[PDB]
Motif scaffolding. Structure first.
Motif, PDB file in Angstrom:
ATOM      1  N   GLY A  62       0.738  -1.248   0.000  1.00 27.21           N
ATOM      2  CA  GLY A  62       0.000   0.000   0.000  1.00 27.21           C
ATOM      3  C   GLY A  62       0.779   1.316   0.000  1.00 27.21           C
ATOM      4  N   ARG A  63       2.101   1.262  -0.206  1.00 29.08           N
ATOM      5  CA  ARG A  63       2.861   2.499  -0.194  1.00 29.08           C
ATOM      6  C   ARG A  63       2.983   3.088  -1.567  1.00 29.08           C
ATOM      7  NH1 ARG A  63       2.187   3.030   5.324  1.00 29.08           N
ATOM      8  NH2 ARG A  63       2.480   0.840   5.938  1.00 29.08           N
ATOM      9  N   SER A  64       3.152   4.389  -1.613  1.00 33.20           N
ATOM     10  CA  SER A  64       3.308   5.074  -2.876  1.00 33.20           C
ATOM     11  C   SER A  64       4.521   5.998  -2.770  1.00 33.20           C
ATOM     12  CB  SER A  64       2.085   5.905  -3.194  1.00 33.20           C
ATOM     13  OG  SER A  64       1.932   6.874  -2.167  1.00 33.20           O
ATOM     14  N   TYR A  65       4.756   6.716  -3.854  1.00 32.05           N
ATOM     15  CA  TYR A  65       5.834   7.663  -3.972  1.00 32.05           C
ATOM     16  C   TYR A  65       5.938   8.529  -2.708  1.00 32.05           C
ATOM     17  CZ  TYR A  65       8.329  11.762  -5.506  1.00 32.05           C
ATOM     18  OH  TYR A  65       9.232  12.797  -5.600  1.00 32.05           O
ATOM     19  N   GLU A  66       4.834   9.180  -2.367  1.00 30.09           N
ATOM     20  CA  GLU A  66       4.718  10.058  -1.211  1.00 30.09           C
ATOM     21  C   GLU A  66       5.207   9.396   0.035  1.00 30.09           C
ATOM     22  OE1 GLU A  66       2.213   9.411  -3.250  1.00 30.09           O
ATOM     23  OE2 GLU A  66       1.846  11.340  -4.354  1.00 30.09           O
ATOM     24  N   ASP A  67       4.957   8.113   0.125  1.00 30.28           N
ATOM     25  CA  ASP A  67       5.409   7.390   1.294  1.00 30.28           C
ATOM     26  C   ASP A  67       6.907   7.367   1.323  1.00 30.28           C
ATOM     27  OD1 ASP A  67       3.030   6.234   2.796  1.00 30.28           O
ATOM     28  OD2 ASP A  67       2.627   5.702   0.649  1.00 30.28           O
ATOM     29  N   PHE A  68       7.480   7.079   0.155  1.00 28.67           N
ATOM     30  CA  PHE A  68       8.926   7.033   0.053  1.00 28.67           C
ATOM     31  C   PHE A  68       9.591   8.415   0.217  1.00 28.67           C
ATOM     32  CE2 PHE A  68       7.483   2.946  -1.612  1.00 28.67           C
ATOM     33  CZ  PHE A  68       8.249   2.081  -0.823  1.00 28.67           C
TER      34      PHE A  68
ATOM     35  N   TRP B  12       7.696  -0.110   8.031  1.00 28.94           N
ATOM     36  CA  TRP B  12       7.145  -0.859   6.926  1.00 28.94           C
ATOM     37  C   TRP B  12       8.119  -0.966   5.756  1.00 28.94           C
ATOM     38  CZ3 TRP B  12       7.553   2.471   2.836  1.00 28.94           C
ATOM     39  CH2 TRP B  12       7.473   3.841   3.090  1.00 28.94           C
ATOM     40  N   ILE B  13       9.162  -0.112   5.740  1.00 22.92           N
ATOM     41  CA  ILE B  13      10.117  -0.167   4.644  1.00 22.92           C
ATOM     42  C   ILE B  13      11.012  -1.393   4.805  1.00 22.92           C
ATOM     43  CG2 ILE B  13      11.921   1.128   5.812  1.00 22.92           C
ATOM     44  CD1 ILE B  13      12.084   2.571   2.782  1.00 22.92           C
ATOM     45  N   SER B  14      11.337  -2.126   3.731  1.00 18.18           N
ATOM     46  CA  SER B  14      12.221  -3.273   4.004  1.00 18.18           C
ATOM     47  C   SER B  14      13.640  -2.742   4.202  1.00 18.18           C
ATOM     48  CB  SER B  14      12.322  -4.228   2.811  1.00 18.18           C
ATOM     49  OG  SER B  14      12.751  -3.471   1.685  1.00 18.18           O
ATOM     50  N   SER B  15      14.524  -3.559   4.733  1.00 19.82           N
ATOM     51  CA  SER B  15      15.910  -3.164   4.934  1.00 19.82           C
ATOM     52  C   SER B  15      16.644  -2.812   3.641  1.00 19.82           C
ATOM     53  CB  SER B  15      16.652  -4.298   5.593  1.00 19.82           C
ATOM     54  OG  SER B  15      15.944  -4.635   6.767  1.00 19.82           O
ATOM     55  N   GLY B  16      16.536  -3.718   2.674  1.00 24.04           N
ATOM     56  CA  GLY B  16      17.189  -3.502   1.414  1.00 24.04           C
ATOM     57  C   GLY B  16      16.729  -2.184   0.837  1.00 24.04           C
ATOM     58  N   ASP B  17      15.429  -1.885   0.978  1.00 24.45           N
ATOM     59  CA  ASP B  17      15.004  -0.614   0.421  1.00 24.45           C
ATOM     60  C   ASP B  17      15.609   0.572   1.188  1.00 24.45           C
ATOM     61  OD1 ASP B  17      13.652  -1.711  -1.716  1.00 24.45           O
ATOM     62  OD2 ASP B  17      11.620  -1.051  -1.055  1.00 24.45           O
TER      63      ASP B  17
END
Ligand code: HEM
Ligand SMILES: [Cl-]
Length: 291
Positions: free
Chosen positions: A10-16, A98-103
């Protein structure tokens, strides 16, 4: 071995953008680190180290699984000193669990570059944490006391050609070596934390002296106080590498464009992006957002 990219649910650009902003603001704030160099440099190094474990032959390693988080990888001698970047990111992850580590590890490198005035680096999300069993063994990162053939050969494992290698090496304009970490010392210090084509210029303009350091390793020392590892110096020893070097020494733009492409590629090695994946995002810097 296939690693398909899976967008965090459910994440989008804005989330990132928010994670980016958080990293950015923190970089701005913790400016004392390493004698006022800031964490920019170390973050760039971490992104490269969790990514350079990739083996194009069997698809093992690479950034996908965030395995740096495991002991084995974490305690890799070639990773000495990266622990500081990790600790920097910790609270961030705590905020955006919610972000993975690799990301996260990879985004930190992108944020660093951009906030250090580097070029924009498009980035893709979707790395998925993998189990401890997937941690590559130590020994896949390059040694510094080698030459041009080593470099060439090494990088081929990662699918990078001559141009990529040189472009990528220009990151060496940043930060510094720490004796306790790698057995290298300098520069005498300066250190820079602005992303420019300085590496190339230094390589072509200084009067390098080969010396042995306190750790018993050779390094090229310049009067002005700069330093270059053997692998760095090798770029001017190889005919093919030298002309690219010269090209970057002369055109920061060209350098930036090529660096961008190679860095993203490096960070995306081994990952498979489904057709329906979102395009790569280009984050805005703080400055662009008036923050
Ligand atoms: C043959 C390839 C490479 C070798 C052997 C290598 C080796 C090194 C060494 C020995 C250090 C200093 C470690 C310390 O004592 O803290 C270092 C510094 C670092 N390297 Fe590389 N490197 C190479 C490629 C890379 C590339 C491709 C990048 C990223 C694009 C990278 C970015 C950095 C940065 C930014 C620093 C400064 C770290 C700091 O200031 O803490 N290097 N590299
Ligand atoms: Cl490195």
């Amino acid at each position: 071995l296939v690693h398909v990219a899976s967008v965090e649910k459910g994440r989008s650009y804005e989330d990132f953008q928010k994670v980016y902003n958080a990293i950015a603001l923190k970089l701005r704030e913790d400016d004392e680190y390493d004698n006022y160099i800031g964490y920019g440099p170390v973050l760039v190094r971490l992104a490269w180290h969790i990514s350079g474990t990739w083996d194009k032959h069997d698809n093992t390693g690479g950034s996908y699984g965030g395995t740096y988080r495991f002991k084995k990888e974490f305690n890799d001698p070639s990773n000495a000193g990266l622990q500081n970047g990790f600790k920097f990111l910790e609270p961030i992850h705590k905020e955006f669990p919610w972000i993975s580590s690799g990301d996260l590890f990879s985004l930190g490198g992108v944020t660093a570059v951009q906030e250090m005035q580097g070029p924009k680096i498009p980035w893709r999300c979707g790395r998925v944490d993998t189990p401890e069993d997937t941690t590559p063994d130590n020994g896949r990162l390059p040694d510094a006391d080698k030459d041009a053939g080593y470099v060439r050969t090494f990088f081929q494992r990662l699918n990078m050609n001559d141009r990529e290698v040189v472009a990528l090496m220009g990151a060496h304009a940043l930060g510094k070596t720490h004796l306790k970490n790698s057995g290298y010392e300098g520069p005498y210090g300066a250190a820079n934390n602005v992303f420019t084509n300085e590496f190339y210029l230094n390589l072509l303009n200084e009067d390098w002296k080969l010396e042995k350091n306190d750790a018993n390793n050779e390094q090229w020392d310049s009067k002005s106080g700069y330093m270059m590892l053997p692998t760095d110096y090798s770029l001017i020893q190889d005919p093919k590498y030298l002309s690219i070097v010269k090209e970057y020494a002369n055109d920061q733009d060209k350098f930036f464009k090529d660096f961008s492409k190679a860095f993203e590629k490096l960070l995306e090695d081994g990952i498979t992006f489904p057709k329906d994946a979102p395009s790569p995002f280009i984050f805005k810097t703080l400055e662009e957002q008036g923050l």
